[PDB]
Design a protein around this ligand. Structure first.
Ligand code: SF4
Length: 550
């Protein structure tokens, strides 16, 4: 068992990632090995899906399936082993079903597909299954250059994050077929174990390109489904009676859970990456979504435990529910999976509504306290020519992007401290669950424009990127001539992929912490420090000064 995709892998002097028996995040050898097999099935599929060789044409099913499956191998998404084997099941079903369509035409020359992952068919039963040992991401650990492995992983791990966005784009109603072609090529090529440090870097930038396309399209879905987030204040206190809290990234599930509970008199609370839902007008319309509860995925355990009603996990950042003994009342949706905790497929929430009604709910409201959220792609560009004014009257000193995931380690204090200690004459543009790091602390404004400007969700770095571009557009300059640096936090594959696209956009002088990834060797991350000056955090006061100045 070996993977290292999260900011929280095993972290040791010798080596990088989690091997051993279990993950740090609760995945077992079983899963994390089975997940490897699913990735291999998946990669083969994608190689046959690259099979519109001249005009072999495309099946939306395969296209639209591949990300959704890959998404399950993601961190804190899925830890139920059967589910994962089953994703592999139907990957191969469609590789085979796919093969037939092309095979009625020219009998695939000499080789239908020259592929490592090939047909990759499999035998049955889980424990006795795990022959995925042949597929682990580092079977050639020392049989390939260690720096080649690092680029390789950051290429796959990265693409993973992109697929998450492809899906929770798709689901919100949008895809593109050229993107799908690019997905499959990249996945197909990653299938074939190959490692050429030149093309790994160069196909780690192209993932960046693609990820932007798809974040393009996913910000396209959110705006079109539920409006353009306009700036909006959210209560983070508890209120009144019975409640269901919904966590994760899928706005669809909240719009449904909202209609279904419409005047049922049970209330909706968001948590984690569901916060920025609140800014969306066709979603904030509801009088029952009361507030937003708790903070940061890193502590579901002790907070979900305290929340009266049931919890609905839309996607990602789920951990072991057994600890807080709330496993009866967590409902995994979509591709989220945890063994033995109820999975709610279908768009019928009434199961969990009635469950919410059985429970305590809240005993009162607390004296409320609101934060401000939903600086939309739209509403951010709204700000720009006033950002440029404020800067152009030495009112706005420089803009700071405190961003990316929350994790668990105390070393994350950095982000909180960084944020308060940003000087009183410059903005924060935050955008992720690490928003929760400094999010409820007091910030003030610069002439009305709030100093803490939430942009929404990890997936909304696309918003942040686009603000910068329109600032560079406007100030006749270039993206890092801009008076903004980026001090991003990170935890999983989506934030890897945002780093890729940020790098691919060519934004130089990024500051990931609170540590840098497990598969980036001091060599390699020094190569990134060659090409893009990407440096780690480690110190709040130093890094403040470095960044303010010319
Ligand atoms: S998800 Fe992260 S913590 Fe869990 S096994 Fe994989 S790398 Fe380790």
């Amino acid at each position: 068992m070996f993977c290292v995709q999260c900011e929280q892998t095993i972290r040791t002097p010798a080596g990088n990632g989690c091997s051993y028996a279990q993950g740090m995040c609760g995945k077992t050898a079983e899963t994390s090995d089975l997940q490897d097999l699913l990735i291999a099935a998946l990669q083969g599929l994608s190689a046959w899906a690259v099979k519109a060789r001249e005009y072999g044409i495309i099946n939306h099913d395969v296209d639209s399936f591949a990300p959704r499956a890959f998404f399950s191998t993601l961190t804190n998404v899925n830890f139920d082993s059967p589910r994962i084997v089953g994703y592999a099941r139907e990957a191969i079903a469609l590789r085979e079903a796919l093969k037939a369509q092309c095979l009625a035409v020219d009998a695939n020359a000499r080789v239908d597909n020259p592929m490592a992952d090939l047909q990759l068919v499999s035998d049955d039963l889980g424990e006795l299954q795990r022959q995925a040992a042949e597929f682990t991401p580092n079977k050639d650990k020392a049989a390939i250059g260690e720096n080649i492995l690092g680029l390789r992983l950051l290429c796959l791990y990265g693409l993973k994050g992109a697929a998450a966005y492809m899906e929770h784009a798709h689901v919100l109603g949008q895809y593109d077929n050229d993107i799908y072609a690019q997905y499959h090529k990249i996945m197909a090529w990653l299938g074939t174990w190959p490692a050429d440090m030149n093309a790994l870097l160069e196909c780690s930038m192209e993932i960046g390109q693609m990820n932007f396309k798809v974040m393009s399209i996913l910000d396209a879905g959110e705006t079109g489904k539920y409006g353009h987030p306009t700036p909006t204040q959210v209560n983070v206190k508890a209120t009144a009676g019975k409640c269901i809290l919904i966590s994760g990234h899928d706005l669809k599930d909240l719009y449904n859970l909202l209609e279904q509970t419409e005047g049922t008199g049970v209330n909706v609370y968001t948590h984690g990456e569901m916060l920025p839902a609140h800014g969306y007008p066709e979603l904030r319309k509801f009088k029952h979504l009361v507030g937003n509860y708790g903070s940061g995925w890193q502590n579901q355990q002790v907070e979900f435990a305290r929340f009266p009603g049931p919890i609905v996990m839309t996607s990602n950042c789920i951990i072991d529910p057994t600890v807080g003994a709330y496993d009866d009342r967590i409902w995994t949706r979509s591709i989220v999976g945890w063994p033995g905790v109820r999975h709610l497929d279908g768009d019928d929430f009434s199961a969990v509504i009635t469950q919410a009604q059985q429970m305590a709910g809240f005993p009162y409201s607390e004296i409320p306290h609101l934060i401000t959220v939903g600086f939309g792609r739209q509403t951010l560009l709204g700000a720009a020519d006033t950002l440029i004014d404020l800067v152009s009257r030495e009112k706005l000193r420089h803009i700071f992007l405190l961003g990316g995931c929350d994790g668990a380690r105390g070393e994350r204090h950095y982000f909180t401290d960084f944020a308060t200690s940003v000087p009183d004459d410059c903005l924060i543009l935050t955008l992720a669950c690490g928003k929760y790091r400094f999010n409820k602390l007091e910030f003030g404004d610069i002439e009305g424009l709030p100093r803490l400007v939430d942009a929404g969700q990890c997936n909304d770095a696309y918003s942040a990127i686009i603000l910068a571009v329109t600032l560079a557009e406007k100030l006749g300059c270039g993206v890092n001539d801009l008076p903004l640096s980026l001090v991003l936090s990170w935890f999983e594959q989506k934030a890897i992929v945002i780093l890729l696209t940020l790098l691919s956009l060519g934004v130089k002088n990024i500051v990931t912490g609170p540590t840098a990834p497990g598969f980036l060797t001091p060599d390699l991350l020094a190569v990134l420090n060659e090409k893009f000056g990407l440096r780690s955090i480690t110190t709040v006061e130093e890094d403040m000064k470095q960044l303010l100045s010319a």
